[PDB]
Design a protein around this ligand. Structure first.
Ligand SMILES: *[C@@H]1O[C@H](CO)[C@@H](O[C@@H]2O[C@H](CO)[C@@H](O)[C@H](O)[C@H]2NC(C)=O)[C@H](O)[C@H]1NC(C)=O
Length: 536
């Protein structure tokens, strides 16, 4: 590590749009709303806000500050503190790959909808007629046409994770475009993104505002809004609610991934990373709540319309459930708009840009570290590494093109983007407070900011944050052993078809969990041992 001296000598609007790039993403617009409805609004929102202040901000500040200090990427930072801690960056890289795997699938879906958004009568605006034009399609009439276009016309979802059917070639063609668009950006887009984020980070708020204006003017919006902030104590006492809220914060802030550390690694040795952390954290949080208010306003409308056809509570709880919640909700909203096609295009364009940028940043979190690992003949240009990475991920991504793809994505998302992040977070915190030393840390921050971190930072970094990730971790093991795995299925032929049918995951589903959530979590401890033993 350089001496503080070595730094000061090696030293010799924008602020806000770079900051914006960190507050928006598919994690805040696609994942957040779906996880909320999974816990009945309030019971998720409340814990999520609590943990965004006690783990979010502290960890974010602790990331920006460590990478500003060491002037090294995530894989160099940890190895520098202590050599037996390379594992952290390695686990960071694995997690990044496992998220990019299904992040592109999301982006494939986004474009698909964009492709279908150039028709005066949008294809989800109503129900399709049977072969004899005798009535509406049954599955479509019992469910919503917006449900029908997501579940049948788009995904052609099966009824189990075991029933795979074929590969949805439409999805393939989009995913091919998504990966190709990604490869093109990785080769050149990188610099362009630095010049394009100025709109990609602003457009979201613009479009969301329009959708907020319509959402709040929809009958029943309030029913939705209040449901988002009235916690069901019983659910608020579930160890899985506090486990999911925990991971959501790390996924929204992009913490426990490595990008933020590398980003700060290129900041001035005197940049105030204490303000950056706060500003970014606040906006990122507002963004998620803002998106939830938009979505829940629409959910309220839909449910209220059914409580009218016929408590609203039950209706709201059974309005929209799953990963496609965002696609279904925002599409329903679009249908209720003048010249809908224009709005559909605007929305899918901004979502595609928000996704492309989010995915590009994630790709870096896989390629950069690999390059540093020096695991390839130097000759091989970054192109080779990137193309190879893209190709490999795309190949596995075909699992989501299957008719059971949605079931797969849900499974992976529930693990690949959860426990692993929690582990990395704790590891990082501990390594900086107990290995690197909190005292040294405080002095270094006092050298670049001028003052030592307040008591808040101290208590959070030393006790509260670590303790929280310990109890939440324990929860994970009281949930994995005290709750049989179950997933909802879309079976048109089933009593209360529109209702949810939570079936049990096959036994082979555990080998999947052990791979996605296990390898990255054990990468840190494994490497440590390797080094230690090798050290003797
Ligand atoms: C409030 O939340 C609780 C907690 O999830 C809900 O209770 C669940 O009800 C379902 C349906 O019968 C059961 O399968 C679960 O086992 C229950 N979980 C627990 C821990 O109680 C409840 O339905 C929600 N509704 C209310 C009362 O607001």
């Amino acid at each position: 590590i350089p001496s503080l001296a070595e730094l000061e000598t090696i030293e010799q609007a924008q602020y806000m749009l770079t900051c914006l790039g960190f507050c928006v993403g598919l994690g805040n617009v696609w994942r957040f709303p779906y996880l909320c409805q999974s816990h009945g609004g309030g019971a998720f929102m409340i814990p999520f806000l609590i943990l965004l202040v006690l783990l979010g901000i502290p960890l974010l500040y602790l990331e920006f500050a460590i990478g500003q200090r060491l002037r090294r990427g995530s894989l160099g930072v940890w190895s520098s503190i202590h050599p037996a801690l390379k594992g952290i960056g390695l686990a960071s890289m694995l997690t990044s790959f496992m998220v990019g795997l299904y992040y592109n699938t999301i982006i494939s879906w986004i474009m698909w909808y964009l492709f279908n958004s150039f028709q005066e009568p949008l294809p989800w605006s109503d129900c399709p007629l049977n072969e004899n034009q005798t009535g509406y399609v049954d599955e479509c009439a019992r469910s919503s046409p917006v449900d029908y276009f997501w579940y049948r016309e788009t995904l052609n979802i099966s009824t189990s994770i075991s029933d795979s059917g074929s590969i949805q070639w439409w999805m393939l063609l989009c995913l091919a475009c998504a990966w190709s668009v990604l490869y093109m950006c990785t080769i050149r887009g990188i610099e362009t993104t630095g010049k394009a984020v100025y709109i990609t980070s602003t457009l979201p708020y613009v479009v969301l505002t329009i959708f907020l204006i319509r959402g709040l003017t929809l009958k029943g919006a309030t029913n939705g809004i209040v449901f988002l902030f009235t916690p069901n104590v019983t659910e608020l006492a579930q160890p899985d609610t506090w486990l999911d809220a925990g991971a959501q914060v790390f996924f929204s802030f992009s913490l426990a991934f490595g990008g933020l550390i590398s980003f700060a690694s290129y900041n001035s040795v005197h940049n105030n990373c204490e303000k950056d952390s706060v500003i970014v954290s606040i906006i990122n949080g507002f963004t998620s709540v803002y998106v939830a208010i938009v979505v829940y306003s629409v959910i309220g409308f839909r449910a209220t319309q059914r409580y009218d056809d016929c408590d609203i509570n039950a209706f709201l709880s059974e309005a929209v459930e799953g990963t496609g919640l965002a696609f279904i909700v925002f599409t329903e909203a679009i249908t209720k708009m003048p010249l809908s096609p224009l709005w559909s295009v605007l929305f899918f364009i901004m979502l595609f840009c928000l996704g492309l940028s989010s995915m590009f940043g994630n790709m870096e979190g896989v390629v950069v570290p690999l390059q540093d690992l020096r695991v390839i003949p130097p000759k091989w240009p970054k192109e080779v590494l990137t193309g190879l990475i893209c190709l490999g991920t795309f190949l596995i991504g075909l699992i989501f093109t299957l008719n059971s793809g949605q079931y797969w994505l849900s499974l992976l998302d529930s693990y690949a983007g959860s426990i692993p992040l929690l582990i990395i977070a704790f590891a990082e915190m501990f390594s900086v407070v107990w290995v690197y030393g909190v005292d040294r840390f405080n002095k270094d921050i006092e050298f670049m900011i001028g003052h030592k971190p307040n008591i808040f930072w101290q208590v959070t970094w030393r006790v509260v944050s670590p303790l929280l990730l310990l109890i939440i971790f324990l929860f994970f093991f009281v949930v994995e052993v005290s709750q049989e795995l179950t997933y909802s299925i879309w079976d048109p032929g089933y009593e209360e078809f529109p209702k949810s049918q939570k079936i049990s995951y096959p036994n082979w589903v555990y080998v999947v969990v052990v791979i996605v959530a296990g390898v990255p979590s054990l990468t840190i401890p494994g490497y440590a041992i390797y080094k230690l033993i090798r050290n003797h």
